[PDB]
């Protein structure tokens, strides 16, 4: 039923901007550290980026700048901006949802992810 | 009621087991605090360690320091979560001290000595007074629910809580070792208890 | 007209909301000043940040220290810009110090205690006195048209303001905290109004 | 009407120099921090280099010490001379003008760019 | 018996004939000990080398710290074993200082002064009071079966075995060549005899 | 009649976990400092990773916070968890038992190993 | 003939034009001297620029500090010119002292208080007591023919020249700003002249 | 006129030692600063190395100790000799002959080259 | 018989002229010695040089402290040879100091004040007592057959040699700069003659 | 008549070991520093390590642990062990003799060297 709102995808030239939006049913990425992670093709599903409860967020080396993770509690829609993407970035994003911080590998609800098309 | 200082707790194994209920005689909820302690572990870079753990009835994790794994202190607060990057992690005993508040969300997350800058957590809210504070374990419920991948298997100690936001400068002299009187829980003048296979013996930093 | 020594203002949201206007007796347009201000943050490797803004009803960045994000301290005057390359940032608390003048059009801009080179900027230009000084927004009009993106969400002190430049050892005792007079706008005797989630409690840094 | 002059291009075997031109209408680059962007076929509209109003001046690591961009006031022709091309600079640089050194995502005016072939 | 002080034992070649017997007159089988020991040898970055060696009749490395070669300092109690990552190692005389008991397992691996994190080891466990202590070979058997590649081809002193788990003041103090009574072996009223082409002579270390 | 058990594992898209397993007849592992190599294709008998005695572990650069070794000493099962598992880390592991952590290139008692296909 | 102690000529822009042409009482053709200068600019990671330079009616570049860039430090002679690699240049005042010599051709060229080894340059070589000695501009004729590329456009000051080689110890003393008696030319007590958008202000550097 | 000689080129298997010529008409490399570029194949005019008019001498990072590079002032022949030639150096080297140090752009006097086989 | 205290010896140019024959009143062939010498060179970058030759009518490199191109300090004692790695060799002066000896053929390379791991060499060997003790020069005989590749093109000085090796705390005060008394061979009391293009002015080392 | 003995070579799959023998006629070795290099099929003369008189020894970078070279003074046969034989490491390596270990470029004595396939 958590059903994360995988959207914001779709194709875009290397090096340019899109919204990945993140949206949650009720309030759940208030507890979750809401996380976007990249299961590109013949890759893993590694996370290019998380964000805390709080607010703090990180990214990945390979992806520092390169996007912008940010909690949007208004309606639970966290919004991930990319700049900058690579043809590495190239792949479909899953935005999930797990609980606290230090357990990233952790998922629990699991949703459908975005595509994303770095040309 | 036992003096700590010059002591620090023996934790040599990852096990769900290990673990030291530190009491306190904290009554009102917590609109304010400050938790510093000197802990040290190489597991920096092999997992996550639960460096300090606060439980209450309705939050496991009402006030957490924690290891984010390659990412340096995820620091909580009623559940709510904060992290400061750590952007390399030494071998060797670090000094943290985190002062989250309910009025501003405000956290000065002291390490080595050192300040992280102020950033907002839980703003407006109250810790719950009960608690089950515990070391070596990140509780998922009530002193419940330890994680062998979440424990700190190095030692901590020094482990001081005021009921009031340090001045930098307290701050900096908690890390130098001089008097303080951490009301909430104090390392000089510490309640607790002992579970698993946690000893207890002369801390290693200075 | 408050004290604000041993203090810093409290910016832990990005927001267009939290900044702080701060007041100035200032009434002669400046032929030449000098800001130094104990700030620090962690977006420097996220994004950029106003460390300063300092607008006109003609200028909205009449002088402005920002954080160019991946380059270092952009410092403008008068609307141009110059920028201090900042090799390598590290998270900890800075006092940068700019210098610019209206004849020589030069910027001591002292940051952390030591010297960038100065560089010309707006030569021959009289900054306007009339100033709706801000810190958190990169304000594109007189206090107004705040940015979250280029806002900063750290903290940030210790800010004076001099129609003077002042000698290269009266900047490094401004870094070391000694007394100073800060004319135009001084942290010690500062006068300021406070808008959105901005607090203000005391500063991190020495 | 802005139309950043793009101009000073051409094909030059790699590694050697040439002088792109930026010419503005008016005097709008006065105001503007303007900057070198590199969009490479295939590649992203990320910028070579820029030069903040006072005169400063910055070049991508790609792109240290490669080229210099200094600021024509006389006509507004910012000048960019690239030195030591090696073949990834061989691109469509555009000469664009954003406002303030901050800001470089923004471009507001936006041109039509100069060819480089690097041989 | 003779004072080994400001002096130490010429460990030039790879060989399985350079050693030194240090004798001891322990009696009871340790529960608890610390050797603390200053060496120097660059075959950190060639190949590992036996730092210090403890035999019994029962395990042939009762007690032994060597360079595991691109990982640091493997330290071994009673024939189990736990390494200390050593991140980069520097041609440079270090002093080590390993603390284990057999009670809490406890291993305060003090190096160069600084302290390795606390771990387990061969926890409740009784060492072999009857030893054959060398220097220079990873004895397979008490006191033989040495090997070249497993040998120390630098210099080492400052061997001083305790019964008892120094405080971390004490082990610093250590470090710094103050005075200590090292019951079961002392470097300063060192019990000894020499095999092979070891020499001995002024120490290269502060 | 060591026969180090060499099971758990098989096929596993890249990036993934997967639990290789360990076991030793009768307790030899206690005095054994265990330790798994890759014998990738092509590739050399290289220690992915290795665990001492005590319970410490090591691993090689290349597997820094790739997998975690831990002794299970209840049945010398001795346990190794492979998280983000890339495409390199597809090979036979030889889960070896020489016997002290110095001693890397001893194995004394040999195995069968356990495939390993990154995907 | 102005006292320039605590002050440095201010170059912040790159052109043709800004120089400052430093008169001297030299009247016989140097067989040896010394110049030391504390200059700083952020050039360095950008191109070259003339830190210090000396001509004469036979030769432009008769002694001639350089920034060779992405090489170090240029120093030439009567022409010929001699190269001293820095292999990383740091954004910082650095205090240069070249001392090269016509009878050995030797050269100290003492770097930030820190010695350059010693090279042979133009030995047995008087040079020219006719100076036209600026700052800013590699003159190709005597005070002519300045390029921007060329130019330095940060600051320069404690400009000093001897007509002897400094020892060692008095080079550092020079460092330290202790009292000196340049004969050649004296910061302290320079005769001097500015063309182009020079300024002078206060030195930045310690 | 200047005609800088350009010999001792040739065939010499990888990482071998060719000796470079460099010889000038009359002594003008007294007052140059000269230097050797590597103009190879689809690449640059950059210098493999430079020396100074006093003697002191430079080499490119990816030469360093490659080549060592020695001004000849007897005949003005300055020697370039090349040891561990590796594949990139394959290339045709140009000793030019610039003034001083720090105008490594400008040549002047140009001549022919030596061409370097590394086999 | 010249004092060479706060004085160091050119050398500006490789060639093989370039050299200094240095007198000694060594009469019986050391069983033990130690040189101490501060030099200084830049070509550590760019190839090997000899930093310090002793010959023999035997044996042409009897003693011979030589930079090994891309490894450090390649130190020899009559004809057979051992090599100190040198992880990363700095721009700046170095006091080396080896120690080798004729019984257990250890030798303590002291470099920059700090201690290189004893290692044999040449054990049980007499060094031949005459000697054309020469700098700048791998002599391939007794004072003769030099190579400028094999030169050293910088500066060296303090060079002194004693007949037995000095205890750690006596090689400290040689970096120091205390007084000594180097029998065999003596900087302060130096006896020599120079050959080539060597010159002799104050040494650049502290 | 030196005839640096080259055996202890063959086929070796990657990252094994091999005995590497280099015997003197007469006891030649005991003045020369004698090193392997690597000749590797168009690749250079590149030394792999070398050994001291005394008995120190150096390994390049690119060889850092992988060989280990000592010194038999016994009959003169220095002795190399290979371990961890990469791929680049398939090469013919030829035990030279050169006099002192300054001069690694001079070799004298010159030999036939002994195959390696690291497979």
Redesign the interface.
């Given at each position: 039923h958590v059903q994360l709102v995988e959207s914001g995808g779709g194709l875009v030239q290397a090096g340019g901007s899109l919204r990945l939006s993140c949206a949650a049913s009720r309030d759940i990425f208030?507890?979750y550290?809401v996380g976007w992670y990249r299961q590109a093709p013949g890759k893993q599903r590694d996370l290019v980026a998380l964000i805390?409860?709080?607010?703090?967020?990180?990214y990945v080396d390979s992806v520092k700048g390169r996007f912008t993770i940010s909690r949007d509690n208004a309606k639970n829609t966290v919004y991930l901006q990319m700049n900058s993407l690579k043809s590495e970035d190239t792949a479909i994003y899953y935005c999930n949802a797990f609980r606290?911080?230090?357990?990233?590998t952790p998922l629990y609800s699991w949703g459908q992810g975005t595509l994303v098309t770095v040309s | 009621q036992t003096d700590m200082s010059?002591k620090a707790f023996?934790?040599?194994?990852?096990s769900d087991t290990s673990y030291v209920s530190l009491k306190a005689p904290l009554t009102k909820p917590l609109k304010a605090f400050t938790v510093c302690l000197h802990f040290?572990?190489?597991l920096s870079?092999?997992?996550?360690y639960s460096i300090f753990s606060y439980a209450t009835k309705r939050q496991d994790?009402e006030i957490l320091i924690?290891?984010?794994?390659?990412?340096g202190y995820?620091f909580?607060?009623g559940?709510?979560?904060?992290?400061?990057?750590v952007?390399e992690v030494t071998?060797?005993?670090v000094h943290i001290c985190t002062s989250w508040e309910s009025?501003?969300?405000?956290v000065?997350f002291?390490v080595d000595g050192?300040?992280?800058?102020?950033?907002?957590?839980?703003k407006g809210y109250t810790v719950g007074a009960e608690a089950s504070i515990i070391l070596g374990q990140?509780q998922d419920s009530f002193g419940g629910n330890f994680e062998g991948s979440?424990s700190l298997?190095?030692?901590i100690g020094n482990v001081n809580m005021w009921d009031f936001?340090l001045?930098?400068?307290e701050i900096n002299t908690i890390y130098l070792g001089g008097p303080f009187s951490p009301n909430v829980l104090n390392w000089r003048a510490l309640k607790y208890e002992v579970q698993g296979?946690v000893?207890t013996?002369?801390?290693?930093?200075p």
């Open positions: 208030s507890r550290t805390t409860n709080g607010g703090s967020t990180h606290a911080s230090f357990d990233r | 010059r023996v934790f040599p194994k990852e040290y572990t190489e870079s092999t997992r996550g994790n924690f290891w984010s794994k390659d990412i995820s909580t607060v559940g709510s979560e904060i992290l400061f990057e952007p071998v060797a005993p009025a501003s969300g405000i000065e002291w050192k300040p992280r800058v102020r950033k907002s957590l839980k990140e979440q298997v190095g030692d936001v001045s930098p400068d296979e000893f013996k002369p801390q290693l930093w």
